[PDB]
Amino acid sequence: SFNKQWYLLANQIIQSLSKYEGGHIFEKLVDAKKQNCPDYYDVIKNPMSFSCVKTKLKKGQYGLPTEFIKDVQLIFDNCSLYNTSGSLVAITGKNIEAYFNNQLIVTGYNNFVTKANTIN
Ligand SMILES: Cc1[nH]c(-c2cccc(NS(C)(=O)=O)c2C)c2c1C(=O)CCCC2
């Protein structure tokens, strides 16, 4: 099935981001008290983590392959927003984002995006 394939591909891609060096910081949502950042959810109004994306792929919340890309990019956009350009967190965010964008090409996930935009 069309939706079954890019669901499978999105699961493999999000799993590789979780195994990427330093990717564990994007796995779960930030605990404001534990991570010593009490203003995180005053700055980030649309939080997103790898586990959030995995749940949506598990429950079947995505209707279009672009919805997966937007949630993942939201993680890296929240990262570059709250974290200073040179910090350790921002560095790893830029690293995984570059890895994620290259995976969308080598896995062919963009092909599901291209065919989906013409359908709609
Ligand atoms: C996307 C993101 N993730 C994390 C995070 C979460 C759990 C554990 C760790 N690791 S640790 C060794 O406790 O510092 C980090 C960095 C943070 C973060 C931020 O936006 C900055 C503020 C909180 C740190």
Side-chain angles (χ1 to χ4, degrees), residues 1-18 20-27 29-32 35-44 46-69 71-120:
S1 173
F2 176 84
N3 290 330
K4 284 182 177 179
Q5 291 313 127
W6 67 259
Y7 257 78
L8 162 70
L9 203 55
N11 265 309
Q12 291 169 317
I13 291 175
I14 195 67
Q15 196 70 231
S16 71
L17 304 185
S18 303
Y20 198 87
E21 177 169 296
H24 58 269
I25 71 173
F26 303 112
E27 185 65 27
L29 292 161
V30 174
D31 193 323
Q35 261 78 67
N36 296 115
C37 49
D39 66 336
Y40 181 81
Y41 297 107
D42 302 328
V43 177
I44 300 304
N46 292 116
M48 189 66 62
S49 66
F50 290 160
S51 60
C52 302
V53 176
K54 291 175 178 179
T55 300
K56 302 173 87 171
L57 287 168
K58 175 188 181 182
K59 307 287 186 174
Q61 297 192 24
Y62 292 141
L64 300 167
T66 60
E67 293 164 328
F68 166 74
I69 296 180
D71 282 357
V72 178
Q73 187 60 34
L74 173 58
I75 302 174
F76 306 135
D77 286 349
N78 292 335
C79 179
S80 62
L81 171 57
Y82 184 85
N83 297 279
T84 305
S85 176
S87 66
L88 292 188
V89 174
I91 288 170
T92 61
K94 296 289 184 179
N95 291 334
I96 304 178
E97 168 184 283
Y99 178 82
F100 170 71
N101 289 330
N102 192 77
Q103 285 303 132
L104 296 179
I105 307 178
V106 301
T107 62
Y109 191 91
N110 288 336
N111 300 321
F112 291 90
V113 172
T114 297
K115 306 219 74 174
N117 300 138
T118 306
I119 295 168
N120 308 112

